[PDB]
Design a protein around this ligand. Structure first.
Ligand SMILES: NCc1cc(Cl)cc(-c2cccc3[nH]ccc23)c1
Length: 324
């Protein structure tokens, strides 16, 4: 069968934990009071939830309320456990309350207010490096705590540009990393899906978030939204193969003894690996540097084991110019 894989960092953090840390189903929810809050307006609608601006009418504090649709509601114990385990961490959203509506019979997660994808195509070279470092602080933190985010994308990064503050949000797909565990490949949003997901390789790890991060980086420095514009999950892999090449793609599936879905035979073809300088033009050359290209190259690798971890990414010369 497929060759097994392990994370090369934080491999055994959850195995040393008392079961309460990762055994989220065992967690008993302490429901707060929904009457403490008044919903002001809907901020967005997704397949998993609806997000609203709200006020805690007791203290007059602004909050963000995420009302969960049935698919997300069924996994609420996992998301709560992850949010509580990570609360206080660098650039992680703060879960403030857990409430249940007796009217609709649905649960909601209440978060401390965060000010705010329209911004990330507008940043200077310095601000891309600065904001990328802030995202890396959150990814190193959750990875070090044995958690994979699995949905890194611009919409899950809330930027308060006036105060140069950033939060990694929507931990709804986040999961505890257990070495040797086979995970569901139906995670992350299409343009940010790692090759491992697209080839149905289930024994993935934290490195998945590093591919997603590279997609965000490629989009920012090249001003190409999204960077890998797949029509569907099959065309998503073809778009990646037109950039990274088919030769390294086949070496990847060979290393892990994976077989592509035969439908790739009439759509994949053969593609040379392109050099990153190929995506440089007059409108984006001020955002590109040899350090940016070297860094990007080291994130966007087929082999999930060969990608920089969050910590190695923070050591990259691309971040030497960022005040620490
Ligand atoms: N006091 C009104 C209020 C405050 C908050 Cl924080 C939430 C809700 C709500 C409305 C509709 C569906 C829901 N599911 C879970 C909560 C919820 C109502």
């Amino acid at each position: 069968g497929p060759v097994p894989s392990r994370a090369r960092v934080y491999t055994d953090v959850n195995t040393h934990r008392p079961s309460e840390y990762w055994d989220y189903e065992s967690h008993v929810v302490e429901w707060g009071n929904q009457d403490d809050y008044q919903l002001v307006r809907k901020l967005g609608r997704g397949k998993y939830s609806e997000v609203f601006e709200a006020i805690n009418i007791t203290n007059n504090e602004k909050v963000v309320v995420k009302i969960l649709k049935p698919v997300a509601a069924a996994k609420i114990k996992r998301e709560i456990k992850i949010l509580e385990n990570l609360r206080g961490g660098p650039n992680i959203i703060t879960l403030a309350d857990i409430v249940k509506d007796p009217v609709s019979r649905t649960p909601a997660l209440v978060f401390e207010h965060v000010n705010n994808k329209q911004l990330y195509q507008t940043l200077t070279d310095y601000d891309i490096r600065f904001y990328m470092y802030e995202i890396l602080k959150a990814l190193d933190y959750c990875h070090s705590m044995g958690i994979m985010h699995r949905d890194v994308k611009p919409h899950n990064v809330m930027i308060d540009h006036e105060h140069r503050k950033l939060r990694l949000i929507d931990w709804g797909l986040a999961e505890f990393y257990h070495p040797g565990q086979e995970y569901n490949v139906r995670v992350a949003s299409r343009y940010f899906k790692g090759p491992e997901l697209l080839v149905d390789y289930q024994m993935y790890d934290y490195s998945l978030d590093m591919w997603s991060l590279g997609c965000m980086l490629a989009s920012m420095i090249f001003r190409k939204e999204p960077f890998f514009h797949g029509h569907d999950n099959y065309d998503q892999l073809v778009r990646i193969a037109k950039v990274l090449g088919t030769e390294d793609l086949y070496d990847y599936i060979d290393k892990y003894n994976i077989e592509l879905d035969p439908r790739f035979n009439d759509i994949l073809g053969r593609h040379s690996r392109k050099r990153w300088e190929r995506f440089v033009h007059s409108e984006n050359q001020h955002l590109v540097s040899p350090e940016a290209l070297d860094f990007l190259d080291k994130l966007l690798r087929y082999d999930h084991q060969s990608r920089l971890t969050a910590r190695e990414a923070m050591e990259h010369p691309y971040f030497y110019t960022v005040v620490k």
